[PDB]
Subunit: 146 residues, 3 copies
């Protein structure tokens, strides 16, 4: 019996692993325990944020070079800059994750963030992986993390 | 062995939970034990019906307000009215599920169904969640349930 | 604690089966233990091949009439001819899989392969399921197998 349950769990592990690859192709990227997935279209920050939260996740929040590289692959594939989850909407000059925590990693392009026009509280990631603070009202690729 | 086998099932459960969220974003919606998934494009009723059946499911068949609201979320997201599986092709005035049973739930807009032009045997759901009988030849968003 | 796990596995099995069908709709097709999935866009051969390999799979490689029929379903649904993995880049006239192994199945359209222009080393599958050797530089629907 204990062995009969083995044959099942074993089959499940194999089937699940195959299904995982299928699911991630071509809009997902796995990095560590995190999975990034793009919706394939653009939206303003507030709408992008809501879409990810309702899906049980949150906007892409790269916390390391490895995660940022994984996210970058999606941006390049779609050739569309994407929104990150971080903003300095609460306190200008201080970017935070949705929880309020301060950034543990950043990859700002030279000179950024610069709050251009005194109205850039959101963050976009370019095809080169670099970050730029941009107006939250702009529309960018929606990428959520799970 | 149980000790280790429990660790495997626990890993599968956790991994699967994550992947379910990933899979449903952004074209799926879970409600109870039913899952709605949109193909993202429009098709006439017959073509839409065949796509769903060949995929191992059937056209969206909301049987409760909760299921209807879940379906509505997809229709709103794609901003395209979708076909439901029910029709009154067999007997005019009596809408049934693909199996033949009569409806157990309905959310008709006022005055519907009205068999306009004496030729509306299919059903579409609007972005406001209401139903309208419509010509089966029209093209509407394809949403299947599994 | 035995019946405990057995219960969880059965239910995990059922949930996985449902998510499998949801996953394949509308861009995937399962045949045997193989799964075909289209990216939904076209790319030149090398780029397409790279996308599949990086995803942990490879370009569509139908090895039987059954596999070819399943692949043809996706080509028909997308209405776009797709690249297969096989090429005769090494030895003109001799088509092989990425491993170097010779074909074990083929469905060449009448008059094919003809190496037209003296430079057609890749293979495409039409909506009718037939194959045609085509210049690897052309762009065709990307379909991987897992
Ligand atoms: O609204 C200004 C933006 O379009 C960007 O213009 C220039 O690239 C730089 O000033 C950026 O920092 C700014 O976000
Ligand atoms: O064929 C007529 C339809 O386009 C719809 O026209 C009006 O909105 C109402 O008569 C509807 O009931 C009808 O389905
Ligand atoms: O470059 C020519 C291709 O477009 C194909 O056109 C026709 O299908 C046939 O001549 C094929 O052999 C050719 O590869
Ligand atoms: Ca500000
Ligand atoms: Ca700012
Ligand atoms: Ca800026
Ligand atoms: Ca009628
Ligand atoms: Ca009618
Ligand atoms: Ca009507
Ligand atoms: Ca050649
Ligand atoms: Ca050739
Ligand atoms: Ca040819």
């Amino acid at each position: 019996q204990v062995e009969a349950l083995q044959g099942q769990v074993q089959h499940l592990q194999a089937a699940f692993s195959q299904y995982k690859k299928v699911e991630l192709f071509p809009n997902g990227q796995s990095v560590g325990e995190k999975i990034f997935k793009t919706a394939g279209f653009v939206k303003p920050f507030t709408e992008a944020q809501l879409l990810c939260t309702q899906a049980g996740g949150q906007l892409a929040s790269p916390r390391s070079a490895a995660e940022n590289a994984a996210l970058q692959q999606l941006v390049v594939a779609k050739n569309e800059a994407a929104f990150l989850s971080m903003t300095d909407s609460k306190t200008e000059g201080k970017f935070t994750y949705p929880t309020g925590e301060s950034l543990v990693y950043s990859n700002w392009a030279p000179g950024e963030p610069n709050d251009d026009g005194g109205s850039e509280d959101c963050v976009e990631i370019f095809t080169n992986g670099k970050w730029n603070d941009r107006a939250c009202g702009e529309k960018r690729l929606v990428v959520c993390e799970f």
